[PDB]
């Protein structure tokens, strides 16, 4: 369980070069978090999937083939203070 914080969104946005206004703290605005922050939130769970013995392989030869996001219908974007 991770709680989203403005510091973390700031670091992530400056890292990837995202300059969008929605992810920068402004007065009178609900600062949001990028959907690429979803992989940061779920890196532990997603990457724990390739470890089990029944899925055996060389992690040094591991190749990330594809990644993608999909918002659920009617679900608002992630925002600051969200316990996720």
């Amino acid at each position: 369980e991770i709680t989203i914080s403005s510091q973390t969104i700031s670091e992530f946005t400056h890292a990837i070069g995202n300059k969008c206004d929605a992810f920068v703290d402004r007065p009178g605005k609900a600062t949001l978090a990028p959907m690429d922050f979803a992989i940061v939130i779920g890196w532990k769970a997603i990457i724990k999937a390739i470890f089990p013995k029944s899925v055996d392989g060389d992690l040094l030869k591991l190749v990330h083939l594809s990644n993608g996001y999909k918002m659920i219908t009617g679900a608002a974007p992630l925002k600051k203070g969200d316990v996720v």
């Binding site: 995202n18 300059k19 969008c20 206004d21 920068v24 402004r26 007065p27 009178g28 605005k29």
Partner: protein, 168 residues
């Protein structure tokens, strides 16, 4: 005497505090450190963001420059420019309001605020202004001309946006 603009006033007071060359280097240290703190704190408080490309394209294809946190308007009085800011502010929330940043003269002003708010400002001003050869029109009923453009700056100095940077 000596003074400065939006930014040079610190250099003015430092030069007023000048002394022999050894003390002048200390004075320069003071001015530089103060401006470093001002710039860093102002950017941290209001970091400029990405700007919608359709919006800057609309601004550019109407004889306008890149949007900036400051918009210079010329050939208009403080009262007229102020009335336009009051319209834009009434139709904007308080946190993205436009305020008089500096009055360079009677017919020369610069206004601080978010680049998007100042773009909407410039849309309103372009709607109200005229391109027109009005020499054949009576002076009392002549449309007002103006050449407004955004200054080369990346911070809304002299505005409420950086007010919370002050105490820091």
């Amino acid at each position: 005497w000596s003074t400065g603009h939006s930014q040079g006033l610190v250099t003015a007071v430092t030069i007023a505090a000048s002394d022999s060359w050894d003390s002048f280097l200390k004075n320069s240290l003071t001015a530089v450190s103060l401006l470093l703190f001002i710039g860093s704190r102002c950017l941290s408080t209001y970091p400029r963001t990405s700007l919608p490309p359709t919006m800057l394209q609309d601004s550019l294809d109407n004889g306008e420059g890149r949007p900036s946190p400051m918009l210079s308007v010329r050939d208009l009085s403080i009262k007229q420019v102020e009335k336009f800011i009051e319209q834009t502010n009434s139709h904007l929330p308080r946190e993205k309001h436009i305020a008089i940043s500096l009055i360079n003269g009677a017919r020369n002003l610069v206004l601080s605020g978010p680049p998007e708010s100042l773009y909407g400002f410039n849309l309103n001003l372009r709607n109200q202004k005229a391109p027109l050869d009005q020499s054949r029109v009576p002076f009392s009923e002549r449309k007002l001309k103006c050449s407004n453009r955004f200054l080369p700056i990346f911070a809304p100095f002299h505005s409420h946006l950086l007010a919370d940077a002050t105490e820091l």
